mmCIF file of C-alpha atoms and ligand atoms in Angstrom:
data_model
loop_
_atom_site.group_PDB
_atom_site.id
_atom_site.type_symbol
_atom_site.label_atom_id
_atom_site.label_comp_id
_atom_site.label_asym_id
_atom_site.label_seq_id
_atom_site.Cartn_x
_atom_site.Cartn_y
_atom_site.Cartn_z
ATOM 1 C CA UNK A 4 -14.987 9.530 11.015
ATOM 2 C CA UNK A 5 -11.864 7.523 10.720
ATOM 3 C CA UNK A 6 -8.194 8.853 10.783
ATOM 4 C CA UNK A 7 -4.764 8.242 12.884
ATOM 5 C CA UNK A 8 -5.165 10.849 15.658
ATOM 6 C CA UNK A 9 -5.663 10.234 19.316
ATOM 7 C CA UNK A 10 -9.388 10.025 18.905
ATOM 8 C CA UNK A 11 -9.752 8.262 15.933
ATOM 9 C CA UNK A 12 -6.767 6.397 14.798
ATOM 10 C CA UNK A 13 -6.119 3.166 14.355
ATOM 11 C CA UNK A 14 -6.965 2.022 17.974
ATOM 12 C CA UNK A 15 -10.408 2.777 17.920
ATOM 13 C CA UNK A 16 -11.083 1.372 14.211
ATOM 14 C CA UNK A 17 -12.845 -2.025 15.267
ATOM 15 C CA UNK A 18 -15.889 -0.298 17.053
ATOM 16 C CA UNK A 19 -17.042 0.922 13.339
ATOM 17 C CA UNK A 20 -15.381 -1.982 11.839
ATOM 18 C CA UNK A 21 -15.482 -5.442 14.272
ATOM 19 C CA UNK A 22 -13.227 -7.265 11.642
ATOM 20 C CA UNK A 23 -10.773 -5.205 12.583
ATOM 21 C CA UNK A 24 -9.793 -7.358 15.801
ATOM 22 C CA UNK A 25 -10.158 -10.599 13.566
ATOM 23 C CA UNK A 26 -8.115 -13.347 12.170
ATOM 24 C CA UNK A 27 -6.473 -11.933 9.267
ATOM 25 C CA UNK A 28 -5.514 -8.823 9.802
ATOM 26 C CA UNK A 29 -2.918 -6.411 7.835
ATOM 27 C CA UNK A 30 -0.140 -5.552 8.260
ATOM 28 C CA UNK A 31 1.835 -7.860 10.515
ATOM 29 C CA UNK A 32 5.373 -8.447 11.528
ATOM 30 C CA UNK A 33 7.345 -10.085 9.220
ATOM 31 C CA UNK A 34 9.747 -12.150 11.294
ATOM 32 C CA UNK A 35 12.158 -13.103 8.252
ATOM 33 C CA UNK A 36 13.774 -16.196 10.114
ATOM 34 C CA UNK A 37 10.033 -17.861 10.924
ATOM 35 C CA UNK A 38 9.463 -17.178 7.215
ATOM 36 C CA UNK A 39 9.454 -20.330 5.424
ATOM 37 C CA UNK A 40 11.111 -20.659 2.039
ATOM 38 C CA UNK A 41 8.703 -22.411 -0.309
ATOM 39 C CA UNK A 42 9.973 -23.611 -4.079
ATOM 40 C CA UNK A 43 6.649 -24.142 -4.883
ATOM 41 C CA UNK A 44 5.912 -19.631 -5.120
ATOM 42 C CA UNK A 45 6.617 -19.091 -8.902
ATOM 43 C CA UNK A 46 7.979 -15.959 -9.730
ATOM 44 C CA UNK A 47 5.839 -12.493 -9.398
ATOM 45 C CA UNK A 48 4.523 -11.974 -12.922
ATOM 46 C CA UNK A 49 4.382 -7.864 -13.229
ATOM 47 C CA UNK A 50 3.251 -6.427 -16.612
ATOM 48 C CA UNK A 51 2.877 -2.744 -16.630
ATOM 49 C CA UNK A 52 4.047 -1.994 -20.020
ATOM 50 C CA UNK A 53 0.692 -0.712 -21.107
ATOM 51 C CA UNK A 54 -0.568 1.094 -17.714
ATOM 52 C CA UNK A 55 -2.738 3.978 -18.055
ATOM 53 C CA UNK A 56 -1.811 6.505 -15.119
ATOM 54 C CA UNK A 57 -5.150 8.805 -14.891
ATOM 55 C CA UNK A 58 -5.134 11.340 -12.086
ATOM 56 C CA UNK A 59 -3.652 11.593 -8.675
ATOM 57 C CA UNK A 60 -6.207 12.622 -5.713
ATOM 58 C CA UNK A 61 -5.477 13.165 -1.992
ATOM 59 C CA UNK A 62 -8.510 10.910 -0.302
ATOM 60 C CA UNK A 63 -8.060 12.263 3.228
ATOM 61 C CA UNK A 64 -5.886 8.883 4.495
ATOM 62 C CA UNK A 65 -3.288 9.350 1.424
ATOM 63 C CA UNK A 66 -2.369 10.110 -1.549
ATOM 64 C CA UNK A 67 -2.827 7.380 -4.438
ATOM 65 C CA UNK A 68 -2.728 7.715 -8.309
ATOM 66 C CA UNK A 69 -5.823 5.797 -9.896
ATOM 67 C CA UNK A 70 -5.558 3.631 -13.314
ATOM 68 C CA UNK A 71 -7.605 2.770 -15.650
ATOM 69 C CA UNK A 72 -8.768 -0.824 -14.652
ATOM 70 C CA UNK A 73 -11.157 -1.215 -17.724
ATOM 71 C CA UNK A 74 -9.513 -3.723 -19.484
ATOM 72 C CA UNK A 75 -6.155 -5.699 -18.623
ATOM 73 C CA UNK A 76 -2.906 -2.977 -18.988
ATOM 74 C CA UNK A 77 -0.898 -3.417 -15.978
ATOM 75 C CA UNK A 78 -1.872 -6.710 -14.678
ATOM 76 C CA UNK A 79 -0.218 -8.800 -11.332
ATOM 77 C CA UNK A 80 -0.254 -12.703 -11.913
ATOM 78 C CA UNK A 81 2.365 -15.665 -10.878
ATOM 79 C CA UNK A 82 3.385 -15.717 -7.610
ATOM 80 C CA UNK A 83 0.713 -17.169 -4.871
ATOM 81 C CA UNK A 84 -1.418 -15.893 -7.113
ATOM 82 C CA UNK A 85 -4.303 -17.543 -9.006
ATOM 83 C CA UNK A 86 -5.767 -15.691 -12.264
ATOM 84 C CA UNK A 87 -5.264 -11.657 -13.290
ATOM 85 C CA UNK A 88 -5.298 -8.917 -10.882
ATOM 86 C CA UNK A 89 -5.767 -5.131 -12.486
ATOM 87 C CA UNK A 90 -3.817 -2.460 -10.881
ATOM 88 C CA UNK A 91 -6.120 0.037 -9.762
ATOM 89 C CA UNK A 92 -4.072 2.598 -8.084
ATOM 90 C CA UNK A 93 -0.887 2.847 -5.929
ATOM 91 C CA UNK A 94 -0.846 5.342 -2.726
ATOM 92 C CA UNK A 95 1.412 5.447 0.272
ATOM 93 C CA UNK A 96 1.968 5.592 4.503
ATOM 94 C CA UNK A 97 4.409 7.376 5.891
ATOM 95 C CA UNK A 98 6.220 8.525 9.288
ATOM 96 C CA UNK A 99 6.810 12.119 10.531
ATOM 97 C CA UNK A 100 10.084 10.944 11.136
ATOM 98 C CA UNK A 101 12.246 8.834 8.629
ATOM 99 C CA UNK A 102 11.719 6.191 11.935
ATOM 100 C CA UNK A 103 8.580 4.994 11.407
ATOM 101 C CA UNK A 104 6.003 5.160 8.246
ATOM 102 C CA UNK A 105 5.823 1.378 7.143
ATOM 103 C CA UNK A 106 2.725 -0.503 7.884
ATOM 104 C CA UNK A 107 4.496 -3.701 7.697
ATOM 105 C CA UNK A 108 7.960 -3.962 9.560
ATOM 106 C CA UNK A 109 10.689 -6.398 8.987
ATOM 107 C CA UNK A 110 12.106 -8.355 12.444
ATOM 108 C CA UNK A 111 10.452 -5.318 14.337
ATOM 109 C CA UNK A 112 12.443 -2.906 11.636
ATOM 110 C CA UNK A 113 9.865 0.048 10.257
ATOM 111 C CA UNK A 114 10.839 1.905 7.062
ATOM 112 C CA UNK A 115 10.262 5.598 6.482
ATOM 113 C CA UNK A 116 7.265 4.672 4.123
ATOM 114 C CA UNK A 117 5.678 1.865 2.227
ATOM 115 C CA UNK A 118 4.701 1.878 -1.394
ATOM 116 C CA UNK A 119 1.290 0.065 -1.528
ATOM 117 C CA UNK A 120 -0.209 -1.101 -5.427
ATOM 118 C CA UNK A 121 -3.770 -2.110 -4.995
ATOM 119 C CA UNK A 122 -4.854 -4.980 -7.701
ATOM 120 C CA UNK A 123 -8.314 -6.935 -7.839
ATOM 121 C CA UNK A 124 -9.018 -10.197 -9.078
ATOM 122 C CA UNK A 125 -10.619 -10.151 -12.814
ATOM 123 C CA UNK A 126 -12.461 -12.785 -11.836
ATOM 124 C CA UNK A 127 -15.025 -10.722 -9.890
ATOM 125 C CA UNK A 128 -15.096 -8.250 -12.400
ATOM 126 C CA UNK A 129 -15.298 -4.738 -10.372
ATOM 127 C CA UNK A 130 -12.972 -3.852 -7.009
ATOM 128 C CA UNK A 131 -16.460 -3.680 -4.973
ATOM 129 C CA UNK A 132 -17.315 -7.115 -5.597
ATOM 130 C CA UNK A 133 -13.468 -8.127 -5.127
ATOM 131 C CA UNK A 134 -13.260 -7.009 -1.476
ATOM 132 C CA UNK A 135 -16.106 -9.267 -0.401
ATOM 133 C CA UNK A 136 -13.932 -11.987 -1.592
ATOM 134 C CA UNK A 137 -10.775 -14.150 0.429
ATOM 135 C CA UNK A 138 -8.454 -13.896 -2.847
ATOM 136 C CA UNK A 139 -10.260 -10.474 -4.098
ATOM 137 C CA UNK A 140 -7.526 -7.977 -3.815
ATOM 138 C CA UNK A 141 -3.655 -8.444 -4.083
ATOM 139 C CA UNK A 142 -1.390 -5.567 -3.089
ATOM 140 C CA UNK A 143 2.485 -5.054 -3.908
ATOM 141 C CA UNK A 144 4.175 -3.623 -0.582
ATOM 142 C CA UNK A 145 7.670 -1.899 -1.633
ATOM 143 C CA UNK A 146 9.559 -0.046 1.323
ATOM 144 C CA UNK A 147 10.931 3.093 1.271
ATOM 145 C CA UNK A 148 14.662 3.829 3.274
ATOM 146 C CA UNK A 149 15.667 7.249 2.971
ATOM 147 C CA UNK A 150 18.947 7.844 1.339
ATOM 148 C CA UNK A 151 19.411 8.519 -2.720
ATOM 149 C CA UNK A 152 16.570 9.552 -4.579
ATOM 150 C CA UNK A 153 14.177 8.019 -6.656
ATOM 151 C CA UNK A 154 14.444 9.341 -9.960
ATOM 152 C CA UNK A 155 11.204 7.684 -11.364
ATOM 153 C CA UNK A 156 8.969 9.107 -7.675
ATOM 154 C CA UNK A 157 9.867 12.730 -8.613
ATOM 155 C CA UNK A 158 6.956 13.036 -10.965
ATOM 156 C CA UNK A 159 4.767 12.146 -8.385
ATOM 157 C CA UNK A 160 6.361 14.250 -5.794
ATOM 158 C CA UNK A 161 6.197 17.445 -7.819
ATOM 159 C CA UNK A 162 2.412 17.801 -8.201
ATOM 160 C CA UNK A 163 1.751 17.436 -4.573
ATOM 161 C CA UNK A 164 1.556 20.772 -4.204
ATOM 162 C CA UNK A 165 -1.452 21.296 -6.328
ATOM 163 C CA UNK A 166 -3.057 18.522 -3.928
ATOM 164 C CA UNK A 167 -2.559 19.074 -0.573
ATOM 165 C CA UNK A 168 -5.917 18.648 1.092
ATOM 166 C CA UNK A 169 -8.295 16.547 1.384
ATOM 167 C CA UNK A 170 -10.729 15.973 -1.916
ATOM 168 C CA UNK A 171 -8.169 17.690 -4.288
ATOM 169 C CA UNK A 172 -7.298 16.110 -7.395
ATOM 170 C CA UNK A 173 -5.389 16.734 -10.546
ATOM 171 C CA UNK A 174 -5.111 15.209 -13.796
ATOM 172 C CA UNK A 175 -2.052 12.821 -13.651
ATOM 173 C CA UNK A 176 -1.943 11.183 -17.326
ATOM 174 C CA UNK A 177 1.532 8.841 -18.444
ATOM 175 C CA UNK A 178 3.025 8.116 -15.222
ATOM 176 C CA UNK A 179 5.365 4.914 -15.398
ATOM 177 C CA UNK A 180 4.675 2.895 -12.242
ATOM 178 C CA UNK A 181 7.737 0.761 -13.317
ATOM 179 C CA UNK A 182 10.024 3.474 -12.440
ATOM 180 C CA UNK A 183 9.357 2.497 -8.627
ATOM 181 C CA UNK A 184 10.082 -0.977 -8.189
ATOM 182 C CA UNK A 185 13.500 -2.284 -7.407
ATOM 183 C CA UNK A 186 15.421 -4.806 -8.596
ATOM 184 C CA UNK A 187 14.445 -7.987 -7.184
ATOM 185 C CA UNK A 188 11.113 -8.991 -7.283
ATOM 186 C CA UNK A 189 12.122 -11.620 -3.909
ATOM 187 C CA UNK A 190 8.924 -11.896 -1.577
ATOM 188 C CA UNK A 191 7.014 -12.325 1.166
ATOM 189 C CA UNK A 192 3.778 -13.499 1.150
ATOM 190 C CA UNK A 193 0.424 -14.073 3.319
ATOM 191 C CA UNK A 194 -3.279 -13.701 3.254
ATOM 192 C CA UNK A 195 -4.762 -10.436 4.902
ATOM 193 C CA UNK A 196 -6.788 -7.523 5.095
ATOM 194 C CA UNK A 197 -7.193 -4.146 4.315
ATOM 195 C CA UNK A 198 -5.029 -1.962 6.345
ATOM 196 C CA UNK A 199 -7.458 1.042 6.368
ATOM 197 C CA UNK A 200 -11.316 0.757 7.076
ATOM 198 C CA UNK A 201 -13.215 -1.272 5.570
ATOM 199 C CA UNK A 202 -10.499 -3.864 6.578
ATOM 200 C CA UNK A 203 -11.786 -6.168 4.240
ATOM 201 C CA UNK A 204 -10.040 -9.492 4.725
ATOM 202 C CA UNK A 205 -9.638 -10.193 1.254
ATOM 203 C CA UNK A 206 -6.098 -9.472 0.602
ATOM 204 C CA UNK A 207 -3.332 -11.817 -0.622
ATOM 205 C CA UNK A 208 -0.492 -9.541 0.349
ATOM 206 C CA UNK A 209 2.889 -9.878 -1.518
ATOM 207 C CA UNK A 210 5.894 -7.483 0.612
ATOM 208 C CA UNK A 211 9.079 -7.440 -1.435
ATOM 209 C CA UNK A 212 12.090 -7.788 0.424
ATOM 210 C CA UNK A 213 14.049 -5.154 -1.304
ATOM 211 C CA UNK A 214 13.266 -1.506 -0.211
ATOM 212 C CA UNK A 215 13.486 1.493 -2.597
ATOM 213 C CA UNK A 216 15.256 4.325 -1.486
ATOM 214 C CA UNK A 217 13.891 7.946 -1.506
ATOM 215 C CA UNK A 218 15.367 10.974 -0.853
ATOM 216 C CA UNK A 219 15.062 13.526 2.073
ATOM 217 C CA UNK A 220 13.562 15.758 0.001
ATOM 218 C CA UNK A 221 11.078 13.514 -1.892
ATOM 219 C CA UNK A 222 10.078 12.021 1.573
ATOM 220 C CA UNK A 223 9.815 16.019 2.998
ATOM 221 C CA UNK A 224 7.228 16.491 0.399
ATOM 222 C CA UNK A 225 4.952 14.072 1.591
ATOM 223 C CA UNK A 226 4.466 15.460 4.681
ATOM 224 C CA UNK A 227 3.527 18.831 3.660
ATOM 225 C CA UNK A 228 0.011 17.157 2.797
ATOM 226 C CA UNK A 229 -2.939 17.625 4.988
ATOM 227 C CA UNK A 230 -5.286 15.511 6.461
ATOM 228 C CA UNK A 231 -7.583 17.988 6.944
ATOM 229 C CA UNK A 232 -9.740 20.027 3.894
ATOM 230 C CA UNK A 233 -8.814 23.583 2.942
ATOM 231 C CA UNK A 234 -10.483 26.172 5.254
ATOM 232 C CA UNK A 235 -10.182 23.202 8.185
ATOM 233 C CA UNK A 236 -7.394 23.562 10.691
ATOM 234 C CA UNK A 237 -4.204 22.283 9.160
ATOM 235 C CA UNK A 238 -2.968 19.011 10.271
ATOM 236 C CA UNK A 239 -0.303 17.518 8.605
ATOM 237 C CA UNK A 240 -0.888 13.911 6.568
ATOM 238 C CA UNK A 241 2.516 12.011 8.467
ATOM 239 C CA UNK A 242 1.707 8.980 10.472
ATOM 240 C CA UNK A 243 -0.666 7.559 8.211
ATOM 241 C CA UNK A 244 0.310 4.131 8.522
ATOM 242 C CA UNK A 245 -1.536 1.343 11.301
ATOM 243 C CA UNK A 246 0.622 -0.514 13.352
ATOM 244 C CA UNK A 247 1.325 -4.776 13.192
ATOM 245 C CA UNK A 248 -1.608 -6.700 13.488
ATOM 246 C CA UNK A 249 -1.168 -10.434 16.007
ATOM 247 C CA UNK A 250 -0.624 -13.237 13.136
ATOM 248 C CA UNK A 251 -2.602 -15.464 14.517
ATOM 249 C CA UNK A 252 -2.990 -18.855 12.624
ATOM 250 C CA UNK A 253 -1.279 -17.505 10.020
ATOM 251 C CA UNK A 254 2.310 -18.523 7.895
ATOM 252 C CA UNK A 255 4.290 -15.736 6.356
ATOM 253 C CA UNK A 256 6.214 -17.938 2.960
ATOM 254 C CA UNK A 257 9.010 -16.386 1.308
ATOM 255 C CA UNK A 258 9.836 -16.500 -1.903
ATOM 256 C CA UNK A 259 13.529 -17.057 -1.920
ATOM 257 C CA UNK A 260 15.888 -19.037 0.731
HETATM 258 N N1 LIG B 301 -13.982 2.878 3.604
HETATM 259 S S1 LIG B 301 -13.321 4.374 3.074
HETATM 260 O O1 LIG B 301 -13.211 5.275 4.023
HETATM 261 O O2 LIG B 301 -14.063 4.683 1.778
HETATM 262 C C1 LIG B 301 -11.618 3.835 2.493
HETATM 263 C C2 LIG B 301 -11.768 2.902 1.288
HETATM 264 C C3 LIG B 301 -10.345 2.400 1.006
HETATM 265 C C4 LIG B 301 -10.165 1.474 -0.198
HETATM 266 B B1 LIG B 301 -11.148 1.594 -1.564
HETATM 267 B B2 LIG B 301 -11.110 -0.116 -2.199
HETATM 268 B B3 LIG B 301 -9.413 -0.526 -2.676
HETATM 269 B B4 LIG B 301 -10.080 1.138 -2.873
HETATM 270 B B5 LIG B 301 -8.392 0.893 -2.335
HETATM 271 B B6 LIG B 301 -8.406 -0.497 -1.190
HETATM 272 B B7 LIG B 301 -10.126 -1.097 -1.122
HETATM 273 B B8 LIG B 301 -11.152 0.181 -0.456
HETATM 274 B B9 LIG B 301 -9.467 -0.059 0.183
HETATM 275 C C5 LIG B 301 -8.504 1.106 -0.632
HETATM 276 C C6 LIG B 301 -7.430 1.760 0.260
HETATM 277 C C7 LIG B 301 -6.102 1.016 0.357
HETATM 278 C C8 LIG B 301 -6.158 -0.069 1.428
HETATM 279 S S2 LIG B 301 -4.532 -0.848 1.655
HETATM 280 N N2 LIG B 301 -3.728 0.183 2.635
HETATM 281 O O3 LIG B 301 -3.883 -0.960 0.317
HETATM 282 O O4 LIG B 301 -4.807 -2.101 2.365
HETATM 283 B B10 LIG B 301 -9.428 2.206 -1.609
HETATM 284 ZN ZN1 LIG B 302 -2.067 1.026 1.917
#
């Protein structure tokens, strides 16, 4: 099975999954001066007033915190985007080192972490049917620097302890995913994949340009996850992010000149 060692990471992904190697691939380089400015992107439309946080489960490849996608609560629209998209859970990849830990990287720059919310289209009415589908899925990217902390993370950070291998979960009821965006909602924006197996292409990614920052601590706490179940030999979750992907025939647009 699948992971980011030696043996299985990232590397060795397209013999289980061929897409892997094809033309839309996630994440990528974002080189900010070949970005083109377009006035036609309308502003990201975020509405999470009414999101319904319901637990928070390491998966073996992260952590994420699941919502309930049942109706239309914390909704993405505006932008490149066409129709609703339903949050259905936010996870995140990180470094061992505050060096490296963002899938996507800015001019070559990697972050300590990146902040991934995973939305599907309404329009194809369950996430399964969504990934089969070019304009399925659209995920928020937020970086993380390291540096103050992140009053509205701490939440999440302080049940990780009661989730540190692989299958755990815990109940995780009235957390505010507002409380980890920043400021500007400026963009970047392309179509792409899944950056873990299946590697769906069926991603409209949106990367905003203005990172959070996280503390040392909050960051430290991460890392203390496992990969690996309880009973299995421990292997810490850190480098859980896969490397930039060759563009291709693809245009990364920007949001703001
Ligand atoms: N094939 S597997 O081993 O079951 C991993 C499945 C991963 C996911 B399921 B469905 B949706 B949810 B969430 B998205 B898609 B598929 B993809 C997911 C992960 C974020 C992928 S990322 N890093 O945001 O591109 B979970
Ligand atoms: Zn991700």
């Amino acid at each position: 099975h699948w992971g980011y060692g030696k043996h299985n990471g990232p590397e060795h992904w397209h013999k289980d999954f061929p897409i892997a190697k094809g033309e839309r691939q996630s994440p990528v380089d974002i080189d900010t001066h070949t970005a083109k400015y377009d006035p036609s992107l309308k502003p990201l439309s975020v509405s999470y007033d009414q999101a319904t946080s319901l637990r928070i489960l390491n998966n073996g490849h992260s952590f994420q915190v699941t919502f309930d996608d049942s109706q239309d609560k914390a909704v993405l629209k505006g932008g490149p985007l066409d129709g609703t998209y339903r949050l259905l859970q936010f996870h995140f990849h990180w470094g061992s080192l505050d060096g490296q830990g963002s899938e996507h990287t800015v001019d070559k720059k990697k972050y300590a972490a990146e902040l991934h919310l995973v939305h599907w289209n309404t329009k194809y009415g369950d996430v399964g049917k969504a990934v089969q589908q070019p304009d399925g899925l659209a995920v928020l990217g937020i970086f993380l620097k390291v540096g103050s902390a992140k009053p509205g993370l701490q939440k999440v950070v302080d049940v990780l302890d009661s989730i540190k291998t692989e299958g755990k979960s815990a109940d995780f009821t009235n957390f505010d995913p507002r409380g980890l965006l920043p400021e500007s909602l400026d963009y970047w924006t392309y179509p792409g994949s899944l950056t873990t197996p299946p590697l769906a292409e069926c991603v409209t990614w949106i990367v905003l340009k203005e990172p959070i920052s996280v503390s040392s601590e909050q960051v430290l706490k991460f890392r203390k996850l496992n990969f690996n179940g309880e009973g299995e030999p421990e292997e810490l979750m850190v480098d859980n992010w896969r490397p930039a992907q060759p563009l291709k025939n693809r245009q990364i647009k920007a949001s703001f000149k």
